[PDB]
Amino acid sequence: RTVARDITLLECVGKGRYGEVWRGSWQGENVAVKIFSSRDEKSWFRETELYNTVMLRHENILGFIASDMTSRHSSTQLWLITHYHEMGSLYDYLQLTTLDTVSCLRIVLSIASGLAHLHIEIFGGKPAIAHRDLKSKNILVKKNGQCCIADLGLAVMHRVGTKRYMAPEVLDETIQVDCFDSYKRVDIWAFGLVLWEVARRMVSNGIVEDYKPPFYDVVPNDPSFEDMRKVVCVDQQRPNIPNRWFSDPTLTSLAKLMKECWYQNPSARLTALRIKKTLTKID
Ligand SMILES: COc1cc(-c2cncc(-c3ccc(C4CCN(C)CC4)cc3)c2C)cc(OC)c1OC
Ligand SMILES: COc1cc(-c2cncc(-c3ccc(C4CCN(C)CC4)cc3)c2C)cc(OC)c1OC
Ligand SMILES: COc1cc(-c2cncc(-c3ccc(C4CCN(C)CC4)cc3)c2C)cc(OC)c1OC
């Protein structure tokens, strides 16, 4: 039998220090091909090791197809092949789109569903997993208006995180590195920021905020570790909740939710499962 391995690379949809992402074609079917830089080879090994341990299958987790290592004359070529989501990242989608109540709730509940799936241990099953790099660039928008979580290169089972999204205990190095729940608490912090990014784009009474990244008003682009620690740990600043949210019952309930993700004390933060329940009772 013929094992068809040819993937036509059609267009580069991402370039960075990590390497590149391509829209590709396999047997007439779009796939996403992440080609890792030598700089980020450990992310390919960690994602491959995780999927060799547990084949994650969830509508809100980016769909795994293949890990490929190919021998080159002077080098090793590393590809991760996944489902392709043509609408792109939540980050990209929020730039150019506003949301209504239904589409705002559908987005954040689908992210919470993917995150609770990562976090939960199932006996028989899956280990508990923490993402450790949750952000709007690591979330893809599907045509049915739900999202899926991408990039398990930093994932831990039971490189550092994007500094803009680091929880206080990571910035001040008090995180209990031996406690698995510590890593879930770090993801909940970052989930609260993503919730804030999305909520800003939900229209109420004819008003919407411009897309902005978390802490846009208090740190530079490519903020330093020190920049983030002063804002988050020393001054204990949190993203602004605009007054206009308090005229809307959905945005009021989401403000409360994001506040309960942002406690300085990691152990006070909501679990992914509690966030899910709260979101199902909203509207
Ligand atoms: C090596 O590499 C790649 C391979 C493939 C690929 C292509 N055709 C068929 C297959 C296939 C799947 C499953 C079986 C089963 C049959 C039943 N038996 C009891 C166990 C084995 C056989 C064959 C694969 C895995 C695609 C790839 O990319 C999309 C590959 O990576 C480049
Ligand atoms: C990696 O990805 C894709 C792979 C394939 C593909 C190609 N040949 C054969 C297979 C296959 C057949 C049979 C078994 C099982 C079924 C019975 N069991 C008891 C033992 C053996 C497993 C696998 C597949 C899945 C198609 C895809 O989509 C069209 C893939 O996605 C891009
Ligand atoms: C976060 O990380 C990973 C993401 C992906 C991935 C999967 N589907 C689609 C995309 C994508 C497609 C298209 C656009 C743009 C380009 C055209 N136009 C301007 C609007 C849309 C953006 C993004 C990506 C980037 C794959 C990965 O692995 C193979 C990733 O890493 C784990």
96 and 82 in one domain?
no
Task: Show the DSSP H helices in the chain as ranges.
Answer: 41-53, 90-96, 101-119, 168-171, 181-199, 225-229, 249-259, 272-281
Q: How was this structure determined?
A: X-ray
91 φ, ψ (degrees, to nearest 5): -50, -55
192 and 97 share one domain: yes
Which residue is it, tokens 């036509």?
A: 8
Q: Please, which residues bridge with residue 33 across strands?
A: 22, 81
Token pair in block for residue 34 = 């992440």
127 and 229 co-located in one domain: yes
Residue 241 in 3-state DSSP?
Answer: coil
Q: In which domain, by residue range, is 283 found?
A: 87-283
Kindly state whether residues 123 and 230 are assigned to the same domain.
yes
**Which residue among 62, 86, 110 closes a domain?**
86
Residues 205 and 92 in one domain: yes
**Protein residues whose CB sits closer than 6 Å to any atom of ligand 3:** 13-14, 21, 32-34, 80, 82, 84-85, 88-89, 92, 138, 140, 150-151
The atom of ligand 1 lying closest to the CA of 27 is 29
152 contact partners, CB below 8 Å, separation of at least 6: 46, 47, 50, 51, 56, 129, 131
Tell whether 269 and 192 lie within a shared domain: yes
The one-letter amino acid code at 262 reads W
Catalytic residues: 133
Q: In total, how many domains does the chain have?
A: 2
Indicate if 240 and 133 belong to the same structural domain: yes
CA-nearest residue for atom 6, ligand 2, is 3
Decide: 26 in ligand 2 pocket, CB within 6 A: yes
- Among 86, 103, 126, give the residue marking a domain's end: 86
Cα–Cα distance measured from residue 243 to residue 281, given in angstroms and rounded to the nearest whole number:
23
Q: Are residues 160 and 126 in the same domain?
A: yes
Q: Do the beta carbons of residue 169 and residue 186 sit within 8 Å? A: yes
Do 123 and 76 lie in a common domain? Answer: no
Statement to judge: residues 10 and 49 lie in one domain:
yes
- The dihedrals phi and psi of 275, each to the nearest 5 degrees, come to -55, -50
**Rounded Cα distance, 91 and 177, in Å:** 29
Please give the angle made by the CA atoms of 85, 94 and 112, to the nearest 5 degrees: 70
Amino acid, single-letter form, for residue 259: K
37 shares its domain with 135:
no
Provide the terminal-to-terminal Cα distance of the chain, rounded to the nearest Å.
54
Residues in CB range of 178: below 8 A, 6 or more apart: none
